[PDB]
């Protein structure tokens, strides 16, 4: 289990819209419109989206560019 989200909050310092972007990503992941960019280790889609956020691949702007594309 991912015991700390400290690096994800260091990516976006509000610590609140972090939850929103991670929820949007994990909702695009659960209802299978999209695919994970990280090799999953039997995590559920919430911890997958946090693991993706902490690695710098996804934020709000990447979501907006990919959605309009």
Partner 1 sequence: IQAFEPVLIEGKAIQLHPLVCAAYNADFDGDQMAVHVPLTLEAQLEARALMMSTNNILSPANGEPIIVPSQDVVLGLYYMTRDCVNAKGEGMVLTGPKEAERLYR
Residues lying near partner 1 in the complex (CB under 8 A) are found at 1-6, 8-9, 15, 18-19, 22-23, 26-27, 30, 45-47, 49-50
Q: Which two tokens stand for residue 11?
A: 């990516």
Return all residues near 60 (Cβ < 8 A) that are at least 6 apart.
17, 21
The residue whose two tokens read 């994800």 is: 8
Least spacing, CB of residue 15 vs partner 1, in Å = 8
Least spacing, CB of residue 4 vs partner 1, in Å = 6
Least spacing, CB of residue 46 vs partner 1, in Å = 5
């Amino acid at each position: 289990a991912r015991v700390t989200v400290q690096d994800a909050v260091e990516k976006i310092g509000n610590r609140f819209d972090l939850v929103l972007v991670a929820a949007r990503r994990a909702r695009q992941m659960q209802v299978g419109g999209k695919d994970p960019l990280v090799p999953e280790e039997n995590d559920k889609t919430t911890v997958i989206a946090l693991r993706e956020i902490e690695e710098g691949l996804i934020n709000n702007q990447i979501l907006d560019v990919r959605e309009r594309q």
